[PDB]
Write a protein that binds this ligand. Structure first.
Ligand code: NI
Ligand code: NI
Ligand code: NI
Ligand code: NI
Ligand code: NI
Ligand code: NI
Lengths: 100, 566, 101, 566, 566, 100
């Protein structure tokens, strides 16, 4: 595989998102780290699919709603940023006010 | 011109009169003073103030600071104020107004070509925490503590050995020398405690001459009157501190006998409430004496719904007790008491207990000293309201009383307040930067000796440092020789004189402890109360002046599930 | 498209050109297999290989560098040898020459 | 005997006339020459050539190399040739024919008992990359860069501090000294840049005397004509390089005023296209001058379908700009221009831009300097075809022009080409071994100073080093004292003379920079074009001799999704 | 008073006559002797024995041990006994009865204020393992080996280079010096082997003078009679050991020719069975000679159902063999023989083979030397029953014979038995503590030079060190300067005299090898058998005195799926 | 658990394979690292089941086909190797030309 440090670091984000994913499935209101991990992993998969940065900046704002996270969480996340390998290389996706 | 207060707060952080909520607690702080000149605040960035000929002057390196923390909201035992913080030669240079005297007024912290900038507007800055109850079970504890905001660690141990699992003791010259050498590899200031349980003075002097800054008396090695007196005699002559974990079994006598053995000499009593160890069930009465500097360990802070259940079994596992044999569970019942556990929270709120510590991996959580201290303050505000010392509609005084528990007081107790413990000029620049929403939980930057040592860091290959995953990673201040220059190894005066640092070829900066014998309860900042406290031998009820001291267990706490992944 | 693929031009490469060669019939008289490398001093190979050791003096196998020739027990075959170059000084092997020639 | 060309290529790697595809791009290289003697190639292994009395001689250590890279296909600015590479005392000894003179002909690289072997048949070997635009935001960047194939890192910073987040400056003697000490812990060659923004010469001289090998002029600290002239004056007298990030705001003047301030003196302009900073919107015209050594940062390389979208928001987040306030987004529009971004790719293909760099975590990706440089070459071949300098049916010249952008040119620009930058005798042995299918993406071996420092490594407990999981792990060349011996800390001549290395007790090998003032655009290998370039103030269109320079955005790129897990 | 044997075993561990099962194998050990005085056992804890004036005396540091392992069940080549172990100055002080002579009888290991305690009741303690067949392919191997219980590693290499992938050779002065410097960073004792394949003595002497403690003769560099004789001549004059990997190809002669070249001189034959390399197919006959110290590498230990299948392909991948070309697979068949692989297990049981080693990442598993050695003993007990030397109803003798294979014998073979190799007074305190259920699989504590270097550690932030996740983590004994003090770098006598340690500025303790030429098969503890062994050239059948030696392949083994996650 | 370094290293391979597994499920053509991780994890589970080395060397060649991976990927993987604890201890499984 010849995994570089950045590929291995992203494995950490993916795993954190698996934890969040299962908890949301149980019907829990996500906390701060769970919310950031879930939305972040969503974007990385979008890039693997070949979606554009423009599409993801918008779609990322519909992963979680205010009713699916604990009180105060939406305000603790003014934005979420993550990079992934798009068909045209690494690009940065910034999702402003992802939770509403 | 004119600017509205809200827009002002968004640009430069809050000012006089504004209030800020500490994380998700009910504690609110109000800015008491602002040392700036409105319109002359320094801000770094494209087209901003800190630029050549503008906010940055023409002075040589010697006439300007190395680092400036701009627009910081300081929270320390002496005040909650807005100001710029200047750091020079790894130490706190000044707290005032930064800039260039050539074009700006009231400049007390000159910024020049040699000045680095840390933008603290909107952030809270505090001194680094000081944990004086460390069991050196593993080196990984230093990173865990550093990340939480603790920059100095005092304790004893040799690794995962039985003696260390149970006591904070680094036994003898060989292990002491070995641990002093290993300390150079850790990113926190360190001081070691030796084994104080012996009735032969020379065996203690040897350890002190080897480098320990204190002696731990622990019941597992025999906390007898003979041992205690011996340790205190040597401490009195070598200017080092003694930490005590008394005779829980009441084997050599009761609490009054131990107090009699101490004989009015200075001593730091560990986990004074008793759950972590000590005369059953009244070791807590020690906080009434002038020569006793009392601290708590953290698993009992604060009293919550699951506390007793976890503790009863924790004690059982830790002491290898057989749960089905009535004779063992009786001793369990004597150590874990709901009565003293609930009272301890109140005693902290009143200032009868002066320090908080962990008791790392020996009935304590190394990364939760700061976090739990604030949870107690929150719970006490909710239950007891404003303290009699409060002024104004804020919790400023309660905040000053509690922050002193893990910063200035432990420093005073162990004779290192001349180097660390608070944000005052001349002290080592061990600072912690916090975002208000994460205060006491997850730091934004942890500075050691003037250099950032650890901080949250996003994707290393990203275009910016913010993309996920963001997790704590060691910075330059934690690397090889830069680390040695930014950390301190504390030694006893005897060791310093004997040339121990040179003999062991210690690479880090060296600091000597002093003033351990002269500190008393009255010296504990905002926590000098000596209550007429009693404990009922049968019911375990704690009373002060006859009134029952107690509190209710929390079902939910702030600084918990909203911040952690697990 | 194949990542890092080669586009080798067709043809052949002539090895050890301009050097003296000779053929020798070799027979393995031992009961265990013997395998000789391309640059080993043929005259000092395993004593079980019967051939004119005198003719092989200063020679090695005329095969692509790094390859070898195997001789199963009782195997007889003709090999082509190419002369050593450089200083033509042989050191090592079975210690029969340890010097020029 | 005779062997077919295909069987030959499989055994010894390709030879004269064979072509090899670089990873999954459309770039093909053709072997120009082979320094071997057919039939005398050295190969290591059971029954192979490198054995006592055969391919290995009887010479003493002094008369043979320490390491030999066998049958390597070299790709450097001077040629694409097949040869053996000899390394002795950590430096490149010879490029030729390896073996034993006792039985083999034309031996120029003697192999003896003291020789280690690295089998490079079927692999491409290149010099280590040199990134001259590093923001020392975190130490983790060094490993990321090393893994990508970059062995030297020049930049400035003190950690995750505001000044460093924005500029490549290590402010003043204290931080400079601290960072030089920390550098000993990192597995790459390092040189630091100080803060050059001051109108008082002595404040710059101090920093140079402390150890910086260059000065960064950044607009955030004030890129004014006074500051620029001051920095250049000191640079001229201390033989150090100046890196520039001009006044984007046009606050002190336009690009012509800045150029006037520079006054024909040597200077390295950072991210000359403008997106990363500089006079809006024509900083790009600087590549026309003889005294300007122009480089690009990597997020804009190459122009792709998502570039503008990500950049507009990246700039917004990085500069704390408010997206809804029309006044801020206007400045955003002035910095990110499709017109200059598309032209930059072409200017690299023509040789008007001479270097590529990252701009690590400040609008740049530290592990993508090499990767992006090749993506541009691929995109330019696809769009523009063969360069006028090409000969034969291959892309050899384009390959030489582009590899020079991150190896020899940055070395020349910063005065370190006497130590590193290319595969030439006498230079430090910083080599990178690549498998053709992974060229420019994931290295097979990264050698620092003659020792392998990092490489892909499989299961540690496996029977062989190849079983999964295979990921990059630090090798012996990255360990303690072996690391110090295999890396260099570059100092200014003044610092070297002042005994800075001894004072700070620096453990690594020391190298001094020289020749920073005498380099000019004409010296940039294969990239010396000085075009008559203009930028329309209104439309932002870039023209050279009146002709419009532009390119089309890529929807898919090589060296991307086929290689990375995320 | 009186206590039942079961309650006694639960409190102090087993005593004379009790048996203990080794992990999940069929091997049972019986306590042969107990050095205690019933009623005077030392136990640490609340209200226990090791307390001031009680089990702890008043002596100064010089008159008491630094560390005491209480109630340990020792398993060493000399006995299986219950006793207390005293450690002083990093070395084994005494094996006896610990305590305070003031109130206890028969005290031979004095405990004082300067004594740390490790509670070993219920645990098995053994010397640290010694692996003499290390390929330094990557530094990560040291941690893997340490965790398994191996504290000394002897081998050669320079990293993931072709020469090292195939042979245990650190070629020449430069690489040798570089590797000696890198060794200071690793938590295990280290000694290096140089390249012994040369017919010029001075080229070998140079390497020895540079620091190697031995020379590896490998067929890949040419295992010719001339080379072998040359290496042995130098070894004879410089008191260093020679390790051999003979001519598998039978290119220079057959096994008898190699033996003739050796000429009765001392030599350590690597992987004597042949699969790992050597004269096909009878290299195994070497174990019959008095001057040959024979060892096995681990992938063939023990013979199991999947062995041949994995080996045939492992050899193919490792040697780059083409599976479809009949000429290559014939050589494959000659090296991997079911006949010799099955016999090897029996030869170990009889004591004809004296050592076990790994052959790390070159047809061997670095973390499975100890584990596989016990699996063989288990398989041999199951198939062959009790050894002729057994006494009583236990496997004590078989256990002593096998533990010697990876502790005392390798130490004797390489001339380092004066420092390490067994639990005897004066030797370096490299000890491994095991819980019986995990013996040979996962250690409870690994001690290096008197300090814990690695051990299982639970949640760092937990109240106790036991909560999950529990995984191996480096302790203080593996940190910077403490590490240097607790590890040894072995040098040849010539290097020690030349001042190599001072020249390279080596930080760790130095030890010199001696007695490598005088060891013979008769000196191998419990493994000195010289059988009249023959191998049929056609069938490959192994016979001793005419009787066929063979065994059956295991389908399931202990110390496997019950313990590992993957 | 007392996880050794090798057990923890394998947790990295397992997680990389989870990423690949989900992407294949989405219908994507796997890339180089995803393919190596997926096939590798398959083998480790086979060993846990008690399958022989001989069986796995063959079965491993049928996890992915040329039509389930990106162009050039089959040629970038001449073989896949992985070790795991079989009932009879650690063994090495080499799958030659796994993708066809
Ligand atoms: Ni205690
Ligand atoms: Ni404690
Ligand atoms: Ni810039
Ligand atoms: Ni920059
Ligand atoms: Ni071998
Ligand atoms: Ni080997």
């Amino acid at each position: 595989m010849e995994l570089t440090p950045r590929e291995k670091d992203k494995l950490l984000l993916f795993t954190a998102a698996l934890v969040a994913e299962r908890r949301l499935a149980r019907g829990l209101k996500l906390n701060y780290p769970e919310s950031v991990a879930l939305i972040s992993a969503f974007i990385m998969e979008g890039a693997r699919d070949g979606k554009s940065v423009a599409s993801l900046m918008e779609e990322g704002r519909h992963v979680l709603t205010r009713e699916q996270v604990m009180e105060g969480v939406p305000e603790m996340i003014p934005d979420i940023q993550v990079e992934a390998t798009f068909p045209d290389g690494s690009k940065l996706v910034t999702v402003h006010n992802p939770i509403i | 011109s004119n600017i509205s207060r809200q827009a002002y707060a968004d640009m430069f952080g809050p000012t006089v009169g504004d209030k800020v909520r500490l994380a998700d607690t009910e504690l609110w702080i109000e800015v008491e003073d602002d040392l700036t000149t409105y319109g002359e605040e320094v801000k770094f960035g494209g087209g901003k103030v800190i630029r050549d000929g503008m906010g940055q002057g023409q002075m040589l390196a010697a006439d300007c600071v190395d680092l400036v923390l701009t627009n910081a909201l300081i929270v320390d035992h002496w005040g909650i104020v807005k100001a710029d913080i200047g750091v020079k030669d790894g130490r706190i240079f000044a707290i005032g107004k930064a800039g260039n005297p050539d074009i700006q007024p009231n400049v007390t912290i000159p910024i020049g070509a040699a000045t680095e900038v840390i933008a603290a507007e909107g952030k809270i800055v505090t001194a680094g925490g000081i944990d004086t109850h460390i069991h050196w079970i593993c080196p990984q504890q230093a990173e865990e503590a550093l990340v939480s905001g603790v920059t100095t660690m005092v304790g004893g141990g040799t690794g995962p050995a039985a003696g260390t699992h149970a006591t904070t003791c680094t036994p003898g010259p060989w292990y002491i020398s070995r641990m002093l050498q290993a300390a150079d590899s850790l990113p926190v200031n360190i001081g070691l405690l030796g084994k104080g349980n012996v009735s032969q003075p020379d065996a203690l002097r040897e350890q002190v001459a080897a480098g320990v800054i204190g002696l731990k008396i622990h019941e597992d090695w025999g906390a007898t009157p003979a041992a205690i007196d011996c340790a205190l005699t040597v401490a009195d002559e070598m200017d080092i501190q003694v930490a005590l974990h008394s005779d829980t079994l009441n084997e050599s006598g009761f609490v009054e006998d131990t107090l009699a053995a101490i004989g009015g000499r200075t001593i730091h009593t560990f986990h004074t409430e008793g759950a972590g160890g000590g005369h059953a069930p009244d070791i807590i009465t020690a906080c009434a004496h002038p020569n006793i500097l009392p601290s708590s360990t953290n698993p009992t802070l604060p009293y919550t719904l699951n506390t007793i259940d976890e503790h009863l079994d924790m004690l059982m596992v830790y002491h290898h007790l057989d749960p089905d044999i009535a004779e063992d569970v009786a001793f369990a019942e004597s150590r874990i008491r709901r009565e003293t556990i609930a009272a301890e929270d109140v005693l902290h709120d009143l200032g009868a207990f002066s320090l908080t510590s962990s008791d790392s991996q020996a009935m304590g959580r190394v990364g939760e000293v700061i976090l739990r201290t604030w949870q107690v303050a929150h719970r006490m505000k909710v239950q007891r309201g404003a303290l009699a010392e409060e002024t104004g509609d804020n919790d400023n005084f309660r905040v000053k009383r509690y922050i002193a528990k893990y910063t200035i007081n432990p420093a005073l107790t162990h004779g290192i307040a001349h180097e660390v413990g608070s944000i005052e000029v001349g002290k080592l620049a061990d600072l912690v930067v916090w975002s208000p929403a994460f205060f006491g939980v997850k730091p934004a930057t942890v500075i050691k000796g003037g250099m950032i040592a650890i901080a949250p860091m996003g994707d290393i290959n990203a275009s910016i440092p913010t993309p996920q995953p963001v997790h704590y990673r060691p910075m330059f201040g934690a690397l090889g020789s830069a680390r040695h220059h930014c950390r301190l190894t504390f030694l006893s005066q005897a060791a310093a004189a004997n040339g121990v640092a040179e003999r062991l070829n210690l690479r880090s900066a060296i600091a000597v402890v002093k003033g351990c014998r002269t500190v008393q309860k009255a010296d504990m900042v905002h926590n000098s109360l000596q209550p007429n406290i009693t404990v009922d031998a049968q019911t375990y009820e704690v009373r002060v002046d006859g009134e029952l001291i107690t509190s209710e267990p929390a079902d939910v706490l702030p600084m918990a599930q909203r911040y952690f992944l697990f | 498209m194949i990542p890092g693929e080669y586009h080798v031009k067709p043809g052949q490469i002539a090895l050890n050109t301009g050097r003296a060669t000779c053929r020798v019939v070799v027979e393995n008289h031992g009961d265990r297999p013997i395998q000789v490398g391309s640059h080993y001093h043929f005259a000092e190979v395993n004593p079980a290989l019967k051939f004119d050791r005198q003719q092989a003096a200063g020679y090695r196998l005329n095969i692509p560098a790094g390859t070898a020739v195997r001789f199963e027990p009782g195997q007889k075959r003709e090999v082509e040898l190419v002369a050593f170059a450089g200083h033509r000084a042989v050191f090592g092997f079975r210690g029969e020459v340890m010097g020029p020639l």
